[PDB]
Amino acid sequence: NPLPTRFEVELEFIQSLANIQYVTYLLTQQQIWKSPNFKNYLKYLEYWCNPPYSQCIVYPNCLFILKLLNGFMESXXXXXXXXXXXXXXXXXXXXXXXX
Amino acid sequence: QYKIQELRKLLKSLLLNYLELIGVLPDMYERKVENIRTILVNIHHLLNEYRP
Amino acid sequence: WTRNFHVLIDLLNWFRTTNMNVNNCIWALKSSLNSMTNAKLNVD
């Protein structure tokens, strides 16, 4: 396929937040948290939750998970450890409802 | 009215093909199973019209 | 033993062919069902 577009790049990146292990890999870092850039980028990616940008969101979870992380970066290892257990409890029910 | 008038037809044809597939078995069966395939696809089309 | 050779075997070869001809359709009947799920597509 030809060269990508920033719309599809940001779309696939925000849609990648639906995966739990990928968010776990993003939070278990040490370089992207030294400068206020990744936080401002995640807070910037909040335009997908509003129309007409919401008409292309395939996975409803990535948006709300984004609002959670943007809700948590305002106010280190331990909480990052805290979230995945709970989300793990939530996942399989939805998976059952999907197919 | 709509596609519901044709679905019946298609359904009625499916059995009519099955009988044929039963009555052949010889190496003629191949040709027949082709037609059967087409019928099934038609069914799928109408259901697509029932999605939205 | 030879007391022609080709004719006495082709019959049973054909009788062996027909059975396989009976068995070759079932696998296609199994593949069609797998081909129908791709065409099949509730709403939340």
Partner: peptide, 19 residues
Amino acid sequence: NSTELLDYATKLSKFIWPA
């Protein structure tokens, strides 16, 4: 509006989580 949900909610039934 409901018109966006009748055409947008149909694509939410086919979707496995991203890998």
